[PDB]
Cell division protein FtsX (Mycobacterium tuberculosis), 198 residues
Amino acid sequence: VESQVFLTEDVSANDSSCDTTACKALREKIETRSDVKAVRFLNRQQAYDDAIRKFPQFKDVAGKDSFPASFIVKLENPEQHKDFDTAMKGQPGVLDVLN
Amino acid sequence: VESQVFLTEDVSANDSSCDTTACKALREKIETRSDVKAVRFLNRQQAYDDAIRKFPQFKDVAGKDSFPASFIVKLENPEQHKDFDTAMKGQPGVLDVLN
Ligand SMILES: [Br-]
Ligand SMILES: [Br-]
Ligand SMILES: [Br-]
Ligand SMILES: [Br-]
Ligand SMILES: [K+]
Ligand SMILES: [K+]
Ligand SMILES: [K+]
Ligand SMILES: [K+]
C-alpha cells in the first residue's frame, strides 16, 4: 500500500525526470515528513503506460495528458495516512492525493 | 490469493447479482470443478468503482460499460492455476483471466 501525490500540469508536461528545482524541492519537502519512508517520482508518460496496461480498453480513448506526474509515497504506517493526506493538500504544488 | 475471471458483456450489462440464467449457469460450471474452493461475484458497478478508485483519470472517458463484471475464484491449489486459466479462457461467457 502506497500513497500517490499528484503534481501540477506544467510539471507534468515539461519535467519527465523531476529535475526542475521545484519538483526536487517538493520531493525533499515530502521526504521531511515524520511519517514518510520513501518517495518515488512517476512521470506522466510512465503513469499513462502503467494504467493503459492494467486496463487495455482505453488505449485509444485516453491520452497521457489526463495523467498527472506524481510521487509514489511509502508511509511509516499506511493505516495512519490522514495526517499525511492533510499536509499534502495544504502543500503548494500538490494537485491532489489519491483517495 | 484469488483468481479473477472476467465476463463477457451479455452478463456484465444485465446482471447486478448473478441472478440471470447466463450468470448462474456459468457460476455453476466454475463452482463444480474439483480445483475450485469458492466463487464470488463482482458486478460491473463494483468493477467501475474499484478501477476509478485506483485511476480517477479514466473518469473522463469511462462509462459503466467500460468495465466488465467478474468472478473472484478461490482455488484449492493457488500455485497451480495454469490449467484453470486455460479452461476458463475456453469457456463461453468468459472474456479473460487476470494475468
Ligand atoms: Br513524461
Ligand atoms: Br451492476
Ligand atoms: Br457473491
Ligand atoms: Br456453456
Ligand atoms: K532529480
Ligand atoms: K522522513
Ligand atoms: K495542495
Ligand atoms: K468444487
